[PDB]
Design a protein around this ligand. Structure first.
Ligand SMILES: *[C@@H]1O[C@H](CO)[C@@H](O)[C@H](O)[C@H]1NC(C)=O
Lengths: 186, 205, 505
């Protein structure tokens, strides 16, 4: 008998809600999908055992966390009230980033790449560094997808000597800060 | 360090003046002869530079030595008189040419400033020993000239082989300190000086 | 003739009174520390034996210049000497020393010249000393420092709109990216507010991630301000606060301004202190945020001791202590967060603040604490349940340790002194881009000088190149003159000697 709201206060809808018991009461417990208001109507009020409201493993794919994972509530000679849990959705973007360590004069002559692993000859993104030592490749999706960050500069070997770095950041996490280092000589 | 430049110039130029005043300059007024010798030395230096541009280190040194010997022989043959006096008009002229060359202009641009490297005093020392080295070269020229006995051509060939001793010693030092190298050059040049005076007392007849 | 690069001491002016060295020309011998005259002579000391009594003796003796040979590594130097050089710095800087002070970097030839000068300075003996008097002469290049009259102190500002309404409270976060040490070109400033601008950048990233999505879009405007012109009395904040208050009538700095956070030297250390100019009034937003901060620092991370520091505003000091002072002057709620406990501590400035002095773990923990306190106060969580025995930033929003490390490395990569970061330098451009990828309405405020009673006039010629010319006194060369006179006499005799020898045969 509480509410399941989001971080700001928006009432989440379609979130599975149940209460799993402990001790000998582990066999008792029901579930209830919350409504638009976030007012769940859990039933099965048996005293003598503490309850644990927490998010069902199945049927809750879109929703990532429940910040108060469990709420200890003492079941006395009455009902429970004011059980609020805040929840976060599952962000799917990757939000790539990463600085570049190089001299100032070499910066305008650089474009970082996003060569996909399966084909190192067909880049999918070519954000130019320009005058800023920070590239912010537009967000990607995260499911395996090994990538490359080959730093493809315009400076040829005819007047300078350099080696272009190559970084693989197989996308299973949530961020990355590739730090390509470009220090040409001669 | 202008006064350092003064001390180095006093070390270098003054012995030439001493030789000029102690060798009877008024006998020929060798100023014209010295100028002609310097012009010949400049021409020989230009020819050596052209040969080096056309064309390992030993060959360049040998060519430079041959050109210097030819110029000294021409200068000596330009005048007739006492053998010691043609010796003087050749050697002093060539030595003055060397001093006016790249052992006075660097002495001007360097030194006189704030830095002090012993290189300048070393250059002055080497310029002073170049006087006796060119004395030896002129002695070789005189042995070549003054008629053709008692294995004199063999001794002249030995002196010619011993010539380019400065380049030989420089190569040896490169293969082997700066002051140690200068001392070694001084001793070998002095040994050639004594060999040449021995040749002179042998040839006086 | 060695050609090393010497970085000069500070030459900034504030409110009209000068500070630091006021000379950038020297042409004297290099007489290191000895009982000799030491007047109008460059004095060479090494940081390993750089005592303050010795330095004050050098300055009082009117030396030609003072050159300090910093160790090349600047990290292998013993920590006790580092602490002593921390305690020497604020007193050394706050003076009108008319003798140039240059800081150099160790070199093999530098070690050789220092050794020779040390041997010659301390020490038949008189003539031998004159003969072997290898005392070098050091001369610099360029002309005297000229007052740069058109230096624009930069400032990067970015907004974050709330959920709905035109009266939302506007929490403000500021951080002065610059850091001045005893040498502007050597003032990397890693543990200084350069470790606070990194936390500000990470807070920007995290709150941008939280605000982009509707369901976590809280109704609290966040005005981030990576201010320039920092330890120089916080001019960048002064001009920004003046232009957003009295010149215009719009902008969020007047509507419903909530607490104004300020971050500086928030890196190393196991203690966090929230400094306030005046105590928070009970019930207001500042008191709520302070309660959230104390609850977080007492329940989530017990390893940090937390305590308010209430320093009353003082209008007599040269600088306004913290950064929240300039905000509290204009009747604006503000407080500063710092690992320090006393503003008088010289742990700031600190050319010694190399990158290896800000521990990444401590920086991450401090960022966690600050970000969680802000999240709890902003999102009204405290009166919603959510016991403080479990965090918000566990997964999918974890404070990126790699990002913090890379940002810190980039900040320390180049000097960040306010006199060297141009209005269009790649440091400022990269900072603006980084803030622009996460914020909205990012721009660049500038303060020139007000051109009347100059609030600040930074000077130039801070990276002069100095030449180590070998030289010997004229007495040596007089000895050489006597020698060459003897040589000339020997040569004069030698002509007649050889003539007699040839005659003898
Ligand atoms: C939000 O906070 C305000 C004041 O901090 C309070 O009056 C209000 O009740 C809070 N909202 C909720 C849902 O607790």
């Amino acid at each position: 008998y509480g509410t399941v709201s989001s971080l700001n206060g928006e009432p989440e809808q379609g979130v599975a809600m149940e209460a799993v018991g402990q001790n000998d009461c582990s066999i008792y417990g029901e579930d209830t999908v919350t409504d638009e208001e976030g007012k769940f109507r859990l039933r099965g009020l048996l005293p003598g055992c503490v309850y644990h409201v927490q998010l069902k493993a199945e049927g809750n794919d879109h929703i990532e966390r429940a910040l108060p994972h469990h709420r200890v509530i003492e079941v006395g000679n009455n009902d429970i009230d004011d059980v609020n849990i805040i929840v976060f959705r599952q962000i799917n973007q990757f939000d790539l980033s990463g600085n570049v360590i190089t001299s100032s004069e070499y910066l305008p002559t650089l474009w970082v790449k996003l060569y996909k692993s399966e084909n190192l000859d067909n880049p999918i993104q070519t954000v130019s560094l320009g005058q800023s030592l920070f590239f912010h490749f537009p967000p990607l999706l995260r499911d395996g997808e090994n990538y490359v960050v080959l730093l493809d500069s315009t400076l040829p070997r005819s007047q300078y000597d350099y080696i272009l770095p190559q970084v693989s950041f197989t996308a299973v996490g949530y961020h990355k800060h590739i730090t390509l280092i470009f220090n040409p000589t001669r | 360090t202008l006064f350092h430049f003064g001390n180095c110039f006093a070390l270098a130029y003054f012995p030439y003046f001493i030789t000029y005043k102690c060798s009877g300059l008024s006998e020929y007024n060798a100023f014209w002869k010295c100028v002609q010798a310097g012009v010949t030395y400049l021409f020989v230096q230009l020819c050596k530079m052209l040969f080096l541009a056309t064309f390992i280190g030993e060959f360049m040194k040998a060519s430079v030595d041959v050109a210097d010997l030819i110029g000294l022989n021409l200068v000596m043959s330009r005048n007739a008189g006492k053998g010691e006096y043609k010796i003087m008009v050749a050697a002093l002229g060539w030595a003055t040419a060397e001093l006016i060359m790249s052992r006075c202009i660097p002495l001007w641009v360097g030194a006189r400033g704030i830095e002090f490297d012993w290189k300048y005093i070393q250059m002055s020392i080497d310029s002073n020993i170049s006087l006796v080295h060119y004395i030896v070269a002129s002695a070789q020229v005189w042995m070549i000239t003054r008629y053709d006995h008692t294995f004199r051509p063999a001794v002249l060939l030995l002196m010619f082989l011993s010539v380019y001793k400065a380049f030989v010693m420089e190569t040896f030092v490169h293969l082997c300190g700066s002051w140690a190298a200068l001392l070694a050059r001084a001793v070998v040049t002095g040994l050639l000086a004594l060999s040449t005076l021995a040749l002179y007392v042998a040839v006086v007849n | 003739a060695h050609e090393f690069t010497v970085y000069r001491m500070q030459q900034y002016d504030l409110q009209g009174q000068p500070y630091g060295t006021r000379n950038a020309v020297l042409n004297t011998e290099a007489r290191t520390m000895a009982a000799e005259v030491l007047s109008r002579r460059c004095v060479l000391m090494r940081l390993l034996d750089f005592s303050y009594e010795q330095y004050q003796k050098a300055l009082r003796q009117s030396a030609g210049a003072v050159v300090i040979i910093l160790p090349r590594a600047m990290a292998a130097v013993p920590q006790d000497v580092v602490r002593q050089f921390m305690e020497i710095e604020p007193e050394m800087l706050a003076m009108e020393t008319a003798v140039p002070v240059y800081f150099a970097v160790e070199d093999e030839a530098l070690l050789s010249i220092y050794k020779q000068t040390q041997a010659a300075s301390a020490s038949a003996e008189v003539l031998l000393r004159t003969a072997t008097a290898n005392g070098f002469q050091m001369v610099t290049s360029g002309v005297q420092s000229k007052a740069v009259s058109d230096w624009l102190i930069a400032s990067v500002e970015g907004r974050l709109t709330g959920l709905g309404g035109e009266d939302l409270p506007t929490i403000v976060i500021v951080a002065h990216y610059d850091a001045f040490g005893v040498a502007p070109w050597l003032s990397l400033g890693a543990d200084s507010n350069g470790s606070g601008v990194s936390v500000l950048l990470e807070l920007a990233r995290l709150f941008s991630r939280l605000y982009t999505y509707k369901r976590t879009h809280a109704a609290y405007n966040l005005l981030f301000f990576a201010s320039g012109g920092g330890k120089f009395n916080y001019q960048g904040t002064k001009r920004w606060l003046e232009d957003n208050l009295d010149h215009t009538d719009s902008s969020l700095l007047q509507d419903n301004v909530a607490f104004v956070l300020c971050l500086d030297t928030v890196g190393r250390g196991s203690s966090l202190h929230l400094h306030v100019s005046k105590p928070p009034r009970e019930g207001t937003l500042q008191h709520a945020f302070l309660r959230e901060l104390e609850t977080v620092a007492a329940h989530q991370f017990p390893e940090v001791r937390f305590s308010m520091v209430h320093k009353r505003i003082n209008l007599a000091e040269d600088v306004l202590a913290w950064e929240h002072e300039r905000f509290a002057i204009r009747r604006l709620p503000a407080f500063t967060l710092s690992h320090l406990e006393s503003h008088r501590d010289g742990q700031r400035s600190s050319i010694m603040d190399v990158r290896s002095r800000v521990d990444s773990k401590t920086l991450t923990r401090n960022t966690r604490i600050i970000a969680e306190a802000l999240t709890r106060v902003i999102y009204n969580l405290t009166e919603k349940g959510t016991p403080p025995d479990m965090p918000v930033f566990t997964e999918q929003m974890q404070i990126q340790q790699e990002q913090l490390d890379s940002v810190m490395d980039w900040l320390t990569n180049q000097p960040r002194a306010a006199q060297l970061v141009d209005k269009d330098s790649t440091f400022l451009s990269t900072l603006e881009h980084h803030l622009s990828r996460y914020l909205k309405d990012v721009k660049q405020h500038h303060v020139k000088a007000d051109k009347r009673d100059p609030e600040f006039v930074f000077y130039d010629q801070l990276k002069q190149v100095m030449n180590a010319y070998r030289v010997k006194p004229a007495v040596f060369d007089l000895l050489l003159a006597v020698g060459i006179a003897a040589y000339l006499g020997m040569a004069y005799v030698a002509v007649q000697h050889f003539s007699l020898l040839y005659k003898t045969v």
